[PDB]
């Protein structure tokens with residue numbers, strides 16, 4: 205189809221940020237063009253997920269549905285971080301897709317995701333993949349999540365806050381925290397449950413967030429929303445090159461199916 | 475200002491291509507955010523312009539107006555390619571801005587711009603700058619042209635064709651030419667008068683267009699619109715990471731001031 209210059213791709217939502225990063229909604233991309241571009245580079249995507257304690261029960265539906273909807277036709281390597289490696293379900297994968305189990309050994313728990321993704325992103329990952337994506341396990345894919353998301357650095361608009369003014373955002377507001385964001389600053393509220401980028405940019409974001417959380421621990425402070433607060437401070441200073449709409453992170457029981465969402469792609473399990 | 479997710483930046487035009495490249499119009503960017511990002515990398519922009527035979531008369535207004543509107547506050551190096559090096563006017567430049575004169579020595583004339591930018595982009599340029607931009611001299615800046623344009627590779631929508639269907643585009647249509655584009659292919663018609671990118675991507679585009687034009691010369695064919703036809707074939711296969719709207723390349727005597735143009739930034743001299 206010919207793009208039409210004098211017809212907006214969307215009339216109801218912002219599709220580009222003020223620093224010229226695309227905000228990814230249905231209707232803004234031609235997946236066949238993008239699929240070609242990324243297949244020409246033999247793109248490999250690493251997906252990291254933590255499944256700790258009773259959350260290992262969510263892995264079966266998470267993986268089954270990732271096989272139906274996540275990066276189908278591209279190279280995918282899943283990295284499952286778990287305290288129960290023997291409890292990872294044996295899900296059959298499509299060609300070009302592999303899964304590795306990485307065993308994990310309260311503020312240390314809070315720092316775990318950034319610390320562990322940082323250590324891992326400098327090892328295995330760094331050889332094994334082009335992009336890394338971090339998501340939570342208590343979720344299911346219901347629709348396409350593909351190479352439209354890939355870029356050097358991305359965050360995802362939090363589904364509770366996309367229509368909120370910045371004063372309402374639940375940033376860390378105590379100047380004593382490394383995650384501090386003043387009341388007059390901030391572009392969006394990004395959710396900790398879906399972020400990613402190139403392996404280099406994920407190394408940088410996770411090192412910065414881990415090192416920031418350690419400084420806060422030394423000072424006796426825990427940011428209001430833990431590594432999400434540090435994610436938002438990082439993405440305020442280092443602006444993402446794409447932003448995913450809440451199509452990519454939704455809770456239907458909580459929030460229904462608003463008119464602005466043409467697809468619910470990755471959703472909370474109720 | 476807080477971006478508002480539920481308000482389109484523009485209701486009247488497409489602001490992102492189907493491969494998720496921004497189309498740059500007024501209202502789509504916050505120049506203060508972009509200026510900061512680019513100043514943090516001490517960005518240097520090379521501007522190339524050819525002024526041959528009687529076209530040297532256009533250099534005075536071109537440079538005077540570039541000093542008022544082009545990349546003010548960033549590092550700029552102008553490279554003036556001319557057969558009359560002694561006829562380049564002595565225009566006073568702002569701080570951080572320099573100008574070099576490069577002397578140039580009918581199908582060879584047609585290949586000149588791509589051949590010469592290719593040779594130059596592998597030398598001087600390659601040390602001296604982060605991005606190269608190629609424009610024509612018979613033009614004036616009337617409004618801001620800044621770092622919003624910078625990206626690995628960009629083309630500019632031709633002001634005569636932005637509202638046209640692809641069949642009407644004046645691509646090279648003879649299969650015998652390296653510039654050939656079939657009747658059912660094509661995203662936009664880009665104009666030869668304003669393109670650019672990182673030095674690496676400009677090296678690649680100019681080498682590819684020069685080598686394509688030489689193959690056509692060997693075969694006794696000249697593409698319908700010369701290096702513009704090769705530019706459009708190149709940008710069809712190697713999609714630009716930003717596209718400039720016709721704000722950036724306009725002819726007011728020919729085309730007036732349509733409602734969709736909030737600014738006329740770089741215009742033909744009548």
Ligand SMILES: CCCCCCO[C@@H]1O[C@H](CO)[C@H](O)[C@H](O)[C@H]1O[C@@H]1O[C@@H](C)[C@@H](O)[C@@H](O)[C@@H]1O
Nearest residue numbers: 362363364373374395396429432454455458472
């Ligand atoms: C009854 C719970 C409704 C909470 C809505 C706000 O979501 C929470 O927002 C904070 C930041 O203010 C954190 O991001 C937190 O993780 C969010 O809660 C989780 O996500 C929402 C959408 C919903 O799925 C909750 O059940 C989750 O606990």
Ligand SMILES: CCCCCCO[C@@H]1O[C@H](CO)[C@H](O)[C@H](O)[C@H]1O[C@@H]1O[C@@H](C)[C@@H](O)[C@@H](O)[C@@H]1O
Nearest residue numbers: 632633634643644665666699702724725728742
């Ligand atoms: C009376 C001239 C009107 C021509 C309009 C179309 O512009 C020309 O388009 C071809 C491709 O079809 C080339 O891009 C050519 O360089 C264009 O002409 C130049 O640009 C237009 C906008 C106008 O400024 C002309 O005077 C130029 O010759």
